[model samples]
Target: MTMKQLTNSMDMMRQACAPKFKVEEAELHGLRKSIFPANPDKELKCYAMCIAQMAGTMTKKGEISFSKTMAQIEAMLPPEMKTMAKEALTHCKDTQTSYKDPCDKAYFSAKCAADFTPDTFMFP
Candidate 1:
């Protein structure tokens, strides 16, 4: 699917899962920091906002498959953002596999801790 289609799908997923997976401000900040380190605190925040959108989508969906989510996320990105989002999505997909369930809070917490590490710390 095209970027817009992929993004719209994700948006639908978010709306569907809003009750379970509401995106938090802190998480959005963290995602922003992870996605755009070089431009941390930039006047405009795209990466973080996009990520937050994805998180909300995932939440509404109740349990979106990692591969599906990654595919959609990758499809929606620009060239440079696609590369970065791919790397991030790959790591997240891998983590999702090890978890008992994607919707499990413990699983997500652990995955987030592991995925967003110092070496992986893209922002300052």
Candidate 2:
């Protein structure tokens, strides 16, 4: 990609990753209370996936832009949280790498994102 295209993509990513209705990050994070569900049900699974899909981190086929999402997350997190998030990001990305299904990949990756943020979290 040309530098111009790359810059545009990055700008689009920021715009797309912003919260619904252009809400504040603090408000958006307030809506997500947990990093990982205590016991994930079908609803919980869908909820996790929905956050990323709604955030524009995933393609129509449920293909998640894990690296891009994390980059976005990294930019938003505090330094300490960024360190923890990066580790979780790598581990979760590696762990979910074998899954052939988009749901599995995105779901697992979503949890990784959740875990990477502060304990309470602001985004997925």
lDDT of each: 0.42, 0.54
* Top of the candidates by TM-score: 2
For model 1, give the 10-residue run with minimal summed lDDT.
42-51
Off by over 4 Å in 1: 1-27, 35-62, 105-124
Model 2, 1-124: lDDT tens digits are 2434434544454355442243454433433443455344444445445656765666677676766767755655555455666666666666456666665666667566566655634444
**lDDT per residue, candidate 1, 1-124, as tens digits?**
4445555654564344333444444554454244323333322232323334454434443443555556654555445445555565555544444535433422343235335553433321
Worst 10 residues of 2 by lDDT: 19-28
Error of model 1, residue 42, in angstroms: 29
TM-score of each: 0.38, 0.52
Error of 1 at 50 (Å): 13
Model 2 clashes, total count: 1
